[PDB]
Amino acid sequence: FAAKFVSHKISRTRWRPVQPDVFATGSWDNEENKVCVWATSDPKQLCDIKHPGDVMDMQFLDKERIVTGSSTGTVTIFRHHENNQTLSVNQRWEQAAPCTAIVCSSPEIVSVGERINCFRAESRDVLRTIDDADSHGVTFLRTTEILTVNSVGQLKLWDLRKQGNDPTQIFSVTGERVPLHCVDRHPNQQHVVATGGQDGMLCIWDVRHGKMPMSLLNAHEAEMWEVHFHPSNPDHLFTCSEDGSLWHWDASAQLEITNLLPSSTLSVNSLDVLGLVCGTDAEAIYVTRRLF
Amino acid sequence: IAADHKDLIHDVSFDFHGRRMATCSSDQSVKVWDKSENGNWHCTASWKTHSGSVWRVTWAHPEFGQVLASCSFDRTAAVWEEIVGESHWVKRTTLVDSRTSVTDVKFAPKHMGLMLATCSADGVVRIYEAPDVMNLSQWSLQHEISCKLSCSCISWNPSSSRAHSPMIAVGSDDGKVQIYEYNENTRKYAKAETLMSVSDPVHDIAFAPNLGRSFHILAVATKDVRIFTMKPLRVTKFEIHTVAQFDNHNSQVWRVSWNITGTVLASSGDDGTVRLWKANYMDNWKCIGVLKG
């Protein structure tokens, strides 16, 4: 677990599309908001992105392109031409209030706010806009269905496929205690979903099998942070908490959850792990690159 | 960046965060600055507040909202609220009651509610409250007390209430110092004590944040700097000591300001020097350093 001081409170981390070796990172909360591509693995600051605007959305828009969403709900994307070390800023929209999470449905980069502005693949005009005010859960349950989850943790399946502006369905806990921080939707089947309770609970979900709260928990300490999951072992996953904490809940094992990570630090940035981070609720600086 | 005021700038004030600045001048306009995240102060808005020169300005606590109060030689105080949608600031109300040109206006501490004081050539300190927080136009006149005639400055005790009682220092002319407190349920201001040994005209006075200290500190910029220590103890329940005097300005001390914590005092004067002060372990003040211009 080779740590590395960026001396920069990290907000983003991607095992890039190209194992978890091409790291990229977006550093919010600095006087000229930061992001670096090819850093570091070894200095390798090939694209330490000099950038106004911060990182709300973020996506490796190709293996040589990078999508992102900017601080005021603006939009920001370039094409990571790693050969010649320059790039071209692809997407720059003004007023898509920031965005609260980031979803995908290829290649319409869907998202949610804390209003929806469906830009898409080369859709430099804002095509779909089901402008429904949200009182941070965002994904593709099936193309192009989604489920907006307001800060009552209040999930509601809507779409952008057919017309309409309501939601089609709604997932909800009995008490709506926590706010919209961290939900889960399984790659084992895109109709399988969970969530993490900001008390330190789970909140597992059944789409077909009713709509009940399947599995809570009581394991972590703080708000639900983010979960490292294996990108091919769906079951293998480990849990975390909003100090940056991490309890290894060996879920390909059966509750085998321990003091996992190089712990006790401040928070963690954003999640992508394949072959890595599981970013916390508060996004500070940390690193380890030994994810096998 | 040039203030953008044609006439001379009387006062500058920071918001709660310290990100925004308000200015007022004799050009009758109030300017609000934004400290951009890119570090340059840019003015947010400027408007013609009053008919006559605007001496003083202040910001209310951010819980109430974005409110700035202003003070003029036109004998009025105005309350303004920032409109996000914008002309940027709208008049909430006008206070006509002062029969003469007003020197100063200050919001009270946040715990008290929307409350402000003002002092004028009439020499009558007035306190206004907003009894409904919802009605920012509903400003009642809470109290009126008499002082003397000439110079004026006000400075509330910023002590959080629950821990301490409200009191306010008024510095007019002088070397004479006048101090006032609040009574139990008389609900009237009484003169607990006075700050003695005041020298020349009291250009400025400020009360220091009493964070982690039982005693209270007030500094006056006369044409000398003084620091007074107030201690209540327990009819009467007040005592002052004079901590220090400082003449290294050699001239008028126009401004005295405190740190957010009350750790640092600052003083400025006709030498064109700004001095920062720390308290010793002995509770004597020492000059840390001097900025010049």
Partner: protein, 519 residues
């Protein structure tokens, strides 16, 4: 003329100046922070991390309770500090094609590392001297010196070998046997009446000459290594460093070293202040000294007070780096109210997390949260939701006014939020729409309180009665009259046909009640 305002900004009122040189033209003046630089951030951040580690380890060890482990644990922390100093040294030259800055800072860091080594040695003397020689090194006759220097830190040729053997026969011994061993070697040298051979004889004159050619510290290390490995009296050694150093003649650093040898620690602190760095690191060192202050010293008790001052100084030094602020609060426990107030002044998710941390460890922070929600409202719904949530955590009346206005002018969201009397009434109305318990709850909500559209609610109640037939309302007709009186009062303070219709509708309920009575 100077006008200064804390945010910091300095501006000048129109005046001759002062000076102005070359020229002063109402130029914007930026006044602020001791803390600076990009890499500076790394070093400051690293220092903060080290402080955090120190806080983390010692307390845990104490929880473990008394052990030698504590003696070794302290040594490990010192080693970590040395490693950090090495990293700082590495960072520097890493500066590339460029100017000159922080070179002096790195020199100061090296001096501090040397001081920490001395402190660890104080917390064996021969090993310490060897380590000092090594640190000095890190910071023909020359070949002979190299041959010796390394040894000390752990026919002519034959004569030199013999001299070396004689030197060996002294280190081995009984110090009395070494005294006699040196004398014999000196006698042999006298008989010899070549320079290398004399050096091998030693005993011990040349080392001083070498120091004169140089350094006094090196000479002292040599003395610890090859003469007698007891270090007790430093007057003579001090004179040698003082005189040998003068002969050799950075001067300020030498003076600081002399002060350290005096043992300070007040003088050392003064020297650090004169250097002005590291400030926070120096404060940490002072805190460590206070922790150590084991040996029954009144000065140490005063020393403890000085250490307490240092933490306050560190807090003053801290400015805006959130993790650093948290570390400072932790140091203070071992500020709270200002921190939260400062966060409120700064004025979102990260701020909320900080507030939660403060709660775990307040009112001002809550007020700041309320102000932020109000600003959001100025989002026109989500700001109210957020602010309302903050209020619930501990404005509510205002939220009720807004929600009630919205429900007169979303419904599911309102129901979820409710899951207050007005909200209950709205729920009852919803139940009535769904299609008696709901209608009853709506009327109880009305009797508790009233609403300005209120007329619409009354109409809805009348509709419910019509659906029901108003058998048991009886009170409502009496209740209705009171409402009418209230309306009249409102009119006095400040649709007639419509008002008549409501009365007719009410009459129907009374008729239904009469029919029920007949039944």
């Amino acid at each position: 003329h100077i006008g200064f305002s804390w945010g910091l900004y300095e501006t000048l009122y129109q005046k001759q100046g002062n000076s102005e040189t070359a020229a002063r033209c109402p130029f914007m003046y930026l006044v602020r922070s001791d803390i600076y630089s990009p890499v500076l951030r790394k070093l400051f951040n690293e220092s903060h991390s080290i402080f955090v580690g120190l806080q983390k380890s010692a307390e845990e060890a104490s929880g473990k309770s008394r052990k030698a482990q504590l003696v070794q644990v302290s040594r490990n922390y010192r080693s970590v500090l040395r490693a950090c100093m090495e990293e700082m040294h590495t960072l520097s030259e890493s500066t590339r094609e460029t100017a000159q800055k922080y070179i002096s800072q790195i020199s100061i860091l090296s001096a501090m590392e040397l001081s920490w080594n001395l402190c660890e040695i104080l917390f064996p003397a021969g090993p310490l001297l060897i380590l000092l020689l090594e640190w000095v090194r890190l910071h023909h006759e020359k070949f002979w010196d190299g041959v010796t220097g390394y040894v000390l830190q752990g026919v002519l040729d034959d004569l030199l070998k013999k001299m070396p053997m004689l030197h060996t026969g002294g280190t081995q011994t009984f110090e009395l046997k070494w005294q006699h061993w040196r004398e014999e070697c000196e006698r042999h040298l006298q008989n010899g009446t070549e320079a290398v051979c004399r050096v091998l004889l030693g005993d011990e004159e040349v080392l001083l000459e070498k120091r004169d050619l140089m350094t006094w510290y090196h000479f002292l290390v040599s003395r610890l290594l090859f003469k007698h490995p007891t270090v007790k009296p430093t007057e003579l050694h001090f004179y040698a460093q003082s005189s040998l150093d003068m002969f050799l003649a950075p001067e300020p650093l030498d003076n600081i070293l002399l002060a350290a040898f005096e043992f300070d620690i007040h003088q050392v602190i003064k020297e650090f202040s004169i250097v002005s760095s590291n400030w926070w690191f120096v404060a940490h060192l002072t805190d460590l000294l206070d922790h150590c202050q084991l040996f029954q010293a009144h000065n140490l008790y005063f020393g403890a007070n000085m250490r307490e001052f240092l933490l306050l100084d560190y807090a003053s030094g801290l400015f805006s780096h959130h993790s650093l602020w948290q570390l400072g609060v932790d140091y203070f426990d071992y500020g709270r109210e200002y921190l939260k107030l400062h966060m409120e002044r700064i004025p979102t998710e990260k701020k909320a997390l900080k507030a939660l941390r403060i709660c775990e460890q307040t009112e001002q922070v809550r007020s700041i949260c309320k102000t932020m929600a109000m600003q959001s409202l100025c989002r026109l719904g989500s700001a109210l939701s957020w602010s309302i949530r903050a209020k619930d955590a501990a404005l509510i009346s205002d939220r009720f006014l807004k929600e009630y206005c919205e429900r007169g002018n979303d419904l599911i969201d309102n129901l979820g939020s409710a899951m207050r009397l007005t909200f209950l009434g709205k729920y009852r109305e919803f139940h009535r729409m769904y299609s008696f318990s709901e209608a009853a709850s709506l009327l109880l909500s009305l009797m508790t309180a009233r609403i300005a559209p209120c007329s619409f609610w009354l109409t809805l109640l009348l509709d419910a009665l019509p659906l029901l037939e108003q058998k048991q309302v009886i009170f409502s007709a009496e209740q209705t009259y009171e409402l009418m009186r209230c309306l009249e009062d409102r009119m006095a303070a400040k649709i007639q046909k419509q008002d008549s219709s409501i009365d007719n509708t009410k009459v129907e309920m009374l008729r239904l009640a009469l029919a029920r009575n007949l039944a």
